[PDB]
Amino acid sequence: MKQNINIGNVVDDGTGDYLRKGGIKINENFDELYYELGDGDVPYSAGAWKT
Amino acid sequence: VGFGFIAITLLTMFINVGLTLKHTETIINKYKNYKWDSGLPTEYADRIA
User: Fold this and answer.
1) Which of the 8 DSSP states describes residue B43?
2) Is residue A8 within 8 Å of A16, Cβ to Cβ?
3) What number of helices (H) and strands (E) belong to chain A?
4) Handedness of CA B28, B30, B33, B38 (dihedral sign)
5) CB–CB of A22 and B39 under 8 A?
6) Could you give the angle at the alpha carbon of A20 between the alpha carbons of A17 and A25, nearest 5°?
7) Scanning A36, A37, B2, B38, which has its CA 20 to 30 A from the CA of A2?
8) Where in the cell is it found (chain A)?
């Protein structure tokens, strides 16, 4: 759920994941990770609480 | 005879601006835009830094 964006091994390798799949792998990771404390717009140095 | 007359003079100037103006040449370009939102699949590799 850290939603690790994976690369295959060394550079040049035909394997990878995608710049597409990274998309929303990248973004949710933000959302998921961030929306915890960042809870939408702005992160709270006072922390995020969800009723 | 019997008449004088009064004479004002004038001048005009005939000049080509436009013959110089033209379009020199037109060019264009071929690009591959990285939008994400794609898979690889066709081929591979190729250009490698």
Assistant:
1) S
2) yes
3) 1, 0
4) positive
5) no
6) 75
7) B38
8) Virion
